[model samples]
Target: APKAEVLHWWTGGGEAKALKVLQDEFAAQNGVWLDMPVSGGGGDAAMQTLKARIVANDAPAAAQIKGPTIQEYDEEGVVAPYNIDAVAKKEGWDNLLSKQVASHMKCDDGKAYCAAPVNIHRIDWIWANKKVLDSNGIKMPSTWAEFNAAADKLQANGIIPLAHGSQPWQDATVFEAVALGVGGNDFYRKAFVDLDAATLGGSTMTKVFDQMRKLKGYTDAGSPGRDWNVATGMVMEGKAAFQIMGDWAKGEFAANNMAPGKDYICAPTPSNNGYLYNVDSFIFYKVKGKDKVEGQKLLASLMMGKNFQKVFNIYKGSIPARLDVSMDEFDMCAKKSNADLKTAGSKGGLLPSFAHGMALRLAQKGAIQDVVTEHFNSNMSSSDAAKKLAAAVKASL
Candidate 1:
């Protein structure tokens, strides 16, 4: 049997369950599977561990790394491109993946190097507790004005209007959504993707901060340093009315037997017609021995296989990275995401997620995240936050 060791950060209940589908498939194919899971800071801790492992020349057969980081590794010549190229061709990955997803997995040479993308997560979503909303006669808010009005009513009724974490990434998550919601797709692309200094410090950015501050008012005192899943749980338990998070929150709701559009509601963030995507992929590292190499190829092929993609994504609350996968087995939310992804793509409204390392490099993302977090936790004026945000991005560059 081929031996394979995999490193990842899928420690949450639903995430772990999703991972088992791949593990079991690998095992059934007569492959030895070793699992290494690192949890905390939304994969930040895992990245640190991966860095240390790479430095020590003790890298696993595969590690979960995605977005531009995959290209970064390829540039450093640490990734096994030849190994993955064979698998990509065998699986017809060139035709299987969407152009948006394919671009992220490819190296600068326009060839897929080490990365095998597993799933696509839509980042700009608001999960709401249906019972709370219906009981309070609050319909789902579609615009910022309506959202504010609804939040005010929830607050006046002594309900926590939003469940949010205070970490840097979480802050950035909400910040990007608010930016897209308030500034629209053009502004989001210019500010996040292009890192345009004018848009970063513009009046529109100040308006985004103003909205972020309003969102902060809806969160509870206990929100500081809370895990993203815990915030999801708050809405699940009816402790809070809603949470502005990615579709991954659906996994938390799914684990508890909560049905969407019934027990809960998954909607795009207020006034946002664009899609912000975060893809999770495994990047293979160069290793000695034929067994390990064979195992790596098998693992990569299975990850993109239609059967595994369907099963894994169903449990993971994300759509398959492969564009040809059927949505028949998925819930309404996943189906909706699929339809929205296509629409956004056609309209040029699909954007990469800044918080999840799909849109910016580590240093640039870290700098912007710090500014957003500071603004959220302090009384900094929106204008100051916008100016500081521009300065931070400039300094990072």
Candidate 2:
């Protein structure tokens, strides 16, 4: 039997459902699929498991990973590049993986066959419960002041105004939304997109922190130790009014049998339009064998295939990374997200999800993670968290 072992952090009611697609697809491709599912929802932990496997020379045929992470390993000569053109030709994937996604997956040598992405996840989503808003007579806010007034009403009426996860990446997710919502597009570009030293230390980042400080009050007392999806659930059940999370939370809503626009709503928070993106890709291991190589290409083809996009994302809670795919199969929130991504791509001002370990370089991610989580858990004044984050910005360089 030709078997393929794939290591990934994606494991759960939702993740399992999504994985079943790949499992069945690979089986049909004449391969036995081994789903080495890791328990942690965070990819960093999952990546660590994949790395350990590679170190032990037991690297899976392909492992799920982020784009840049694949580039780094490719630089180390640990990942084997295949004929992506062959994959591109197999099922008309040239337009499927856009130039934007190709730019992220390309190695320094300019070859882009390193990783195959399943979906595009924009981390800057602000999900709200319509019933909570209707009952409180609150409308979708478009500014910080309006958001505050609406949030105040929710709290006053005995509902938590916001639901945020205590996890580090989750903390970073909310912070990124607040940063863009407050600082707008230009400031976000300067601070994160460009990583300007002067602007990061200057007043712009301070203002971002000011908005972040306001968020601490809106969340509930038991906000600590919460997963991001659970926070989204609070909004779904009307226990809370809003949650600033990634697009991946859409999976939780769908699994709960809720349609996006009819039951809950997904939108950018009070902001002047900033879009941040991350990709979920499968990186092939540098294994030498015909069947393994065949399975790898099959996996790549499956990811870029048309039918799989709707099935995978519906379970994975993300939009298809492919540009040619239509949103008619997706819910209302996903269609809006697709439009936002296309605009941001054309505008050339798209930013990475720092919370998902993209913006900050290697050494600084740990410190920023610790500081944000500590602040959220301890209620350590936002002023202090801001200072800590500022320090991380400095140390990150």
Candidate 3:
């Protein structure tokens, strides 16, 4: 019998590199990992294929699904309910997951869903090459104004100050950070999560666009069509000064043997300490008898097990979903992220990432993402973009 047939879209780059850690662990435990990988950037095509597979009764036992899709699967009645009460109690999961994280793990009735989660990527991060900044006589900027000043200096010295890709999704990823940093948490939730038209069209949102435009000025021409990791490489290779990407970029740095707090520094985006969270979660399909169910349990256990969680996320460039992990072996950036994750959550500053598909349904999310990228890559004025954003989201709803 097959131990597990996993359908996932983590087919490239750091995602694939980190996935090996889990595969190795499963193999060591006398289990098999039947790899059914879906190769697509951002899982767009893979999701279409997954839909067809489920309809044809060929669904893999476990698949990668996150945010609102988790609930969507459960409502469709195909997701299996795993008995993880033993694992949850043994590992003290109650204390490990925040209310927000826990909500994502459960069905509407508060029962555990067919999901096993591993890591939380803090999306509102600004990664800087330490040597890139130091060589230009610039310090790590603490505010948007300071960031612009530093960007000016770096550009004058002939370096791309902010490494960016103009892809719609990538543009929204950067915009989400700027929105949180400039508009504050209340505004972020209203404009993004609640879809409040007033906030979406308000002056706070204008500030977000202003900052985004300023950041845009720092990018080079080639940045218009570059991939995200390629932009990260510009920073890593000392051709660029900064990248406003999520913590997953840390994996690339680690892959290049770059030292944290030395070769690079990760900090909250200028002007706020909020955490914009995107969880990489796995959802399981209804499986037949013993072996498959047992495999699901085993995979869930390994996914949340303290050692594997730590090892997997260390290589994956995100903090473990289980919050109880110690930071002794983690790099300086990881330690700061751990502390900030708690502080922000307690202070009501933690929020789901709309850009990463955690805060909205697909329709609303895609509509908002389209407007954001249009504003980013066009000559659309801040206020005009804000109005269009509100209208697009309203229409989607």
Candidate 4:
């Protein structure tokens, strides 16, 4: 039997269910699936373990990795000699994947390498409990000012306005949305993607931090150390009025038997006209034994296949990474997300997610995340935070 040991960070209730789809599919192919789950700080803990394992020459056959990190591994000469390029080419991936997604999966040599993308997750989503919004006479906010006004009204009624986790990644996730909503797509690209010093320390970035600080006020003290799913649950149970999170939160809502636009409302974050995407992918590693190598190739092929893509993303609360996959069976929220992604791509509004490691290298991403979390947790002035952000990016470079 072909044995494939996989490492990843999908240990949460809804996430685990989504992962099982792939596992079952692999098992049906007569492959052995060895599961290694590391959960915390999104994939940070998993990456740490992967690094240690790689150095010890005990790397898993495949591990969850995405964004520039895939290229970084390739550049380090650690990417497997037997990569997914053969599978990707044989499967006609070039014609199937979106250009933006295709670019990330391929190395500079213009060949598919270590990574095989699975699904595209849109960040900058605002989820609200329908009962809470309706009883409070609150409509979904379309602008930051309206969001503040709604939050104030919810607060006045003795309700927690924003359901948030105070973790670094969660803080950066909300901060990125606020930056996009406040500063527009151009500014977000300049600051995050371009890492321009001027944009990082400018008055606009200061304003972004000001809005983030305002959002901080809306969260409760119990938010510290809370997991993102817990925050999503708060909104689902009506303990809070809103949560600004990624579409992955939808999985949590789905697991609870809630339907979008009825039981809960899924809308873009206020003033978000662009799509910020975070794709989940697996990076294969070189391993001995023909069975393990064949197992890795099979896993990669299944991940990009239409059948696995559809079933996995449905349970994962994300759209298929393959552009040709039909979204007919997907819910209203997913349909909207799929439409918005195309529209944004055409209009130059499709942006990679900085909070999720799609826009920057790990070091720079961590540096900026640190600054954002520090400012959110403290009474740090927006101007000071902006300056610190610029400095942090420079230091990382």
Candidate 5:
């Protein structure tokens, strides 16, 4: 088969390694894999280029339609629904995938649509340098109260207590975790999911705000305007106690030649740590040529294969998207993730992140972030923050 040109923004050392899984699988299927790897600094820039190319009728064969980007494309009819019956017959895709992801892959017709989910990435991990903690005679904090005590110890030892970036996405990242972990899952859902202003303005929510203020004390002064990778560096260099980030932070540590559960450790942030997953999936745009569309189907099948999920997430530092994929192929971090995700789901702690919101959408999430960062970065009180947040939500709706 002829090589299909695929465009994506996976350019970092780790990301490049992640792409190797696809390249290998595609090659194994005797298909050509033309890698159009672009560095967008982030997806925003890549998105602009992607939309331009699509408009000019120059879209690639398969694009990395990550997270909510799938929703946007699916709505515009830019992407087409795929029949996974072939993959289903082979891999039993329905039984393997979590209900959460399956639900996200819907069309307006209540049919399976464009974006097919690939891997699951949790956004609430606290990656730490184990050597720093062992040297300081500390263990991984399993509770919020314990986390603060450990953070205080790190601060006293002149280590930055936390690693954080001042970007809106970064701020939203931590804010969602704090809201979920400290404020209770029901409270989190009531505020973000249910959109209850009273719940959003209550004592539980205020406690999360106070915790955010506390977390701010741990961040490096230079953290303002830093990239998420820079904050990751603080942990990698042992300058900070821990980083509130996604499990992908493992890539940074891996780039530094550190081993998870060895030089570094990955754990869910203390709170409601079920999943809070963000998926990176391929949304097959309507392909004209029969062979090309077949190739896209081939891509989807290969992507969700048990072997490919193991290969990709291993290099990418996330768990396999399949719940049915045996965890034996994964390392310490994936094992922890698998265990926690099940525990959280069963115990009623699984949640979608507000920044990566399922409701009120990303625009509303952005408006909320603006309100929060303004309050966190300033001397605004909780009452003031809540008032402004309520107003922003009302206006955004």
Candidate 6:
């Protein structure tokens, strides 16, 4: 039997539901889906597994990855350049994808290689429990001050104001959102993308940390060592009033049978007008024989196909990577997200998420996450955290 082994870090029920689409589609194309599911809500564990596989000279046919890491693997020559030229021309990818999204799918040779773009996920989103807000007489906040005001009321009324995990990456996610909300896009790009020492150590960063400190007081004592999705579940179950997370939280909500704009509300984090995107894609490794090659292209075509793209992204809590697809069936939150992504694409407002590995290389991103998490867990002041960030970031570079 012609079998294709694909590795990925999507073990959740909602994400797995979407993967079932690809698996069934490939099976219909006369191939067997050898699913290599890894158990990390985040992609970190899957990446480590992939590295070990490569070292053992037994890489899978394809593994889900994105950002500069794709290029990093391509440089090693283990990832075979999968020509998307036919699909690109047929689907008008140049017109369909924004430059920022398209740029992540290519190699240094200026050609699409190893990876196929799947979906665009907005990271700077705050999910709220509608009941908590309506009951508390709190409206959707547009800035940090308003958010804090609302959160204070929730806590005063004996509710967990914020749902958050203790993971470093999760801390980094919240930190980046705060940075974007406080500093705006220009400063976000300078600090996260450019790794500017001035922005990292400046008074602005001090404010970001101060905001983070204010937010920390709202979380419950049980938050430490919790997973991100578990925190999302707290909001879903009404144990918490809000959670600052990415659009991927939608999948968790879906799994819990919760509906947006009704049971919950999705909005940009306070003071953020721009979109920070995290794209999910799979990189195909070099493999021999017609069956493997045919399977590879078949998987690629199915992933990029309009039908699969539409259905997969709907369940996955993200929007289609293809611009031509419609969001008519998506929930209210997803439609808003789609519109924001389009506007950000045309405007200079779209930026890759450093927390999700879209803005910086892994090593440098790791450094930032460490400092941010340490500050969150410690009694360090905002100024001290800002200084630590600058030193850590510079050392990482």
Q: Show where candidate 2 strays beyond 4 Å.
A: 81-86, 89-92, 360-362, 378-387
| Tens-digit lDDT track of model 1 for 56-79 | 888899999868888777777777
Lowest-lDDT window of 10 residues in candidate 5? Answer: 80-89
The 10 consecutive residues of candidate 4 with the worst lDDT sum are: 106-115
In the range 104-147, model 3's lDDT, one tens digit per residue, is: 87664566645778998888888999998888888888788889
In model 3, state the lDDT of residue 363. Answer: 78
Please write out the lDDT profile of model 4 over residues 1-397, one tens digit for every residue.
8789999999977799899999999999999999998997568788889989988989889989868888887786677584678888888888998877888887645565567899999997999999999999999888889899999999999999999999998999999988888998999999999999999999999999999989999999899999999899999999999999999999898888999988999999855469899999988887888899889889989999897888888888989999888898898888989999988887778899988989988898899989999999999999999999999999899
**C-alpha TM-score for every candidate:** 0.98, 0.91, 0.93, 0.98, 0.88, 0.95
The per-residue C-alpha lDDT of model 4 at residue 70 equals 82
- How high is the CA lDDT of each candidate model? 0.89, 0.74, 0.82, 0.89, 0.75, 0.85
lDDT of 5 by residue, 1-397 (tens): 7446687877776777788778888888888777766664335456667789888777777887555556666677766645443455465666777877766655544456455566777777888888899988889987778888999999999888898888766787788887888877787778887778888777777788888888888887897778777788888888887998877787677767888878888878767545676677776676567667767778878888877788788878778877767778777887877787788888777777666444445567778888888877887788778777877887887
Pairs that collide in candidate 1 are none
Better of 3 and 6 by lDDT: 6
- What is the Cα-based lDDT of residue 70 in candidate 1? 80
Candidate 1 lDDT (Cα, 0 to 1): 0.89
Better of 4 and 5 by lDDT: 4
Regions of candidate 4 where Cα sits further than 4 Å from its true position: none
**Cα lDDT tens digits for candidate 6, 267-378:** 8985445888899988778776667767777777788888888999888899998878888998888898888876876666788898887888788888999999999998
Q: Give the range where candidate 3 is weakest over 10 consecutive residues by summed lDDT.
A: 80-89
Which 10 consecutive positions of candidate 1 have the poorest summed lDDT? 105-114
Among the numbered candidates, top TM-score falls to 4
